[PDB]
Amino acid sequence: KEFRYRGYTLEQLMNMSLEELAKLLPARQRRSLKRGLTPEQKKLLRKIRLAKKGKYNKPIRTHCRDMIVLPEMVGLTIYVHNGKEFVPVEIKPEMIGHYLGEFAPTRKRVQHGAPGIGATRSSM
Amino acid sequence: AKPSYVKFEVPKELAEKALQAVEIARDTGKIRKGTNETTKAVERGQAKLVIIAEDVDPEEIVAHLPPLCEEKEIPYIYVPSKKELGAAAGIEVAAASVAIIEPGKARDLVEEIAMKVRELMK
Amino acid sequence: PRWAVNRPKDYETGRDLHLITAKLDMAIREDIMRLRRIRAYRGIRHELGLPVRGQRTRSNFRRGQTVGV
Amino acid sequence: QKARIKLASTNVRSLEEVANQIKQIAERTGVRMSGPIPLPTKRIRIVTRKSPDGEGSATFDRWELRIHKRLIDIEADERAMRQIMRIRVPEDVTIEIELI
Amino acid sequence: GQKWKLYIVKDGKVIRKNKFCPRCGPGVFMADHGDRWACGRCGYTEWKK
Amino acid sequence: AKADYNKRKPRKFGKGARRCIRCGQYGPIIRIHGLMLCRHCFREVAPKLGFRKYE
RNA sequence: UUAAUUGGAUUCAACGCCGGGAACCUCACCGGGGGCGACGGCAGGAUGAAGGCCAGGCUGAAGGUCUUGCCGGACGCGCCGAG
Ligand SMILES: [Mg+2]
Ligand SMILES: [Mg+2]
Ligand SMILES: [Mg+2]
Ligand SMILES: [Zn+2]
Secondary structure, eight states: OOOOOSSOHHHHHHHHOOOHHHSSHHHHHHHHHHHHOHHHHHHHHHHHHHHHHOOSSSSSEOTTTTTTTTTGHHHHHHEEEEEEEEEEOOOOOGTTTTTTTGGGGOOOOOOOOOTTTTSSSTOO | OOOOSSSSSSHHOOOOOOOTHHHHHHHHEEEEEOOOHHHHHHTTTTOEEEESSSSOOOOTTTTTHHHGGGSOOOOOOESSSSSTHHHHHSSSOOOBOOOOOOOOOOOOHHHHHHHHTTTTTO | TTTTTBOOOOOOOSSHHHHHHHHHHHHHHHHHHHHTTTTTTHHHHHHOOOOOSSSOOSOHHHOOOOOOO | EEEEEEEEEEEEEHHHHHHHHHHHHSSSSSOEEEEEEEEEEEEEEEEEEOSSSSOOOOOOOEEEEEEEEEEEEEOOHHHHHHHTTTTOTTTTTEEEEEEO | OOOOOOOEEEEEEEOOSSSTTTTTTTTOOOOOSSOOOOSSSSOOOOOOO | OEEEETTOOOSSGGGGGGOOOOOOOSSOEEEEGGGEEEEEHHHHHHHHTTOOOOO
């Protein structure tokens, strides 16, 4: 009942070069990685590696909704901005390859009320 | 530097050639005030006339120029009053050292007083 | 050819597979369930029964009865 | 040993005047000059909504600019080239001379 | 206030504790980190002893 | 440096990379044949440029 | 309905209309972070005003602020007018 992504365990994915991992991700993620990380994404990755190495034991918050989830981020907790607040996202192995913004909805679910004046032809 | 330092007397000719030889050279020259600025001027030799006034207490930022006097030629003179020093050259404040570099038509009396100070005490 | 099968690059094994009938249905159900377990935007759209591929929903996609004022 | 002269203008009369003067110069000397060939007119059409706001029936302007052209061939002879090179066309006329 | 001290000076001798940045000449003074020569304007990673 | 936080980013595409040369508006810019003029401004200066309404 | 779902137009003569096919920009809305007062004058200021920085904190990110200490020389939003 272990986890496997294309026939590979999580540990095998940990010791994989970035370029090698791009061949297993889908087309959009392969193109994005081939074009390089943005400088803000670079800063976030530096903080993530620092936290993994045993340093920086403070919550990690970010405005980077377009960051792709990588195998080295699994196990951490990251606070992703959704427009007005930073919401907590816990990285699970099955999240590998998705954008962070996919886990921080920006809109509230709609619960409708009673239609008002002007909502029908005979109500105007 | 400061009145509380007996170097020599207050010769009238020294004030005569240190004060009344810069108003006619202000309109034809450059001026660099400030002991922090001049410390570099004096060390690197940028300054041409070091006029050091006796108004700076304590002997903390004044105890740099007299020790550095014998390292370069530094034709140097002293100013009795500070209120009008900026009026003679600069602005309407109290100045500590107004360095003029290469002034126009300000040579004969300056050379004579510099020779007198060289033959006075160094 | 490998570009003609209905499940290229399988998520578990990584091979190029083709499925029919019950296995196909269970694989689709597993894909949707995996999306739902991680609480991805698409999984939430699947749960609420709303369009998942970016459509506008103000005018069309109406299934119900008229509300009165 | 032949020169190609290209002309363009927004005004038909001036264009005609310059071509006729070059023709007179080529007549005043023993030299063959292929007649002024008319190339197709260039038309610039721009269609715009008339109203500054968006209220009322939509109505449109169709603005047009027309640029006429001519082509002249002559054999490069200095006795004839000096006369044509010293002609001054009006400011609204472009003239270009090349040797082929 | 005033910041000009920590330069070792006696009655007639002058020598600076903080050296000048090699890209420029003397007179400009660095910081006193102890770990490295901050130098204020350019920067160096040399691990001053 | 404080003036850095007043300055605009120099874009090369999008609506923000083109302004009317007469009034400064963004938006409905006529790009035909190198003109850079709003639809509003082109209507009132078209006769001065040599355009005519034949039909 | 929402933190906000920016605003105009309602018979013909409002509703693929505002040349309105908005990912950034556009933008006017919402959450958050910074910056700006020619000219007259007040406290002030070379015994140096205002302004500018290597490194590491705070931070979404920032000499924005801070800590560590360097820089440069003449105007001056801590104040009232005024723009
Ligand atoms: Mg609306
Ligand atoms: Mg679009
Ligand atoms: Mg926008
Ligand atoms: Zn315009």
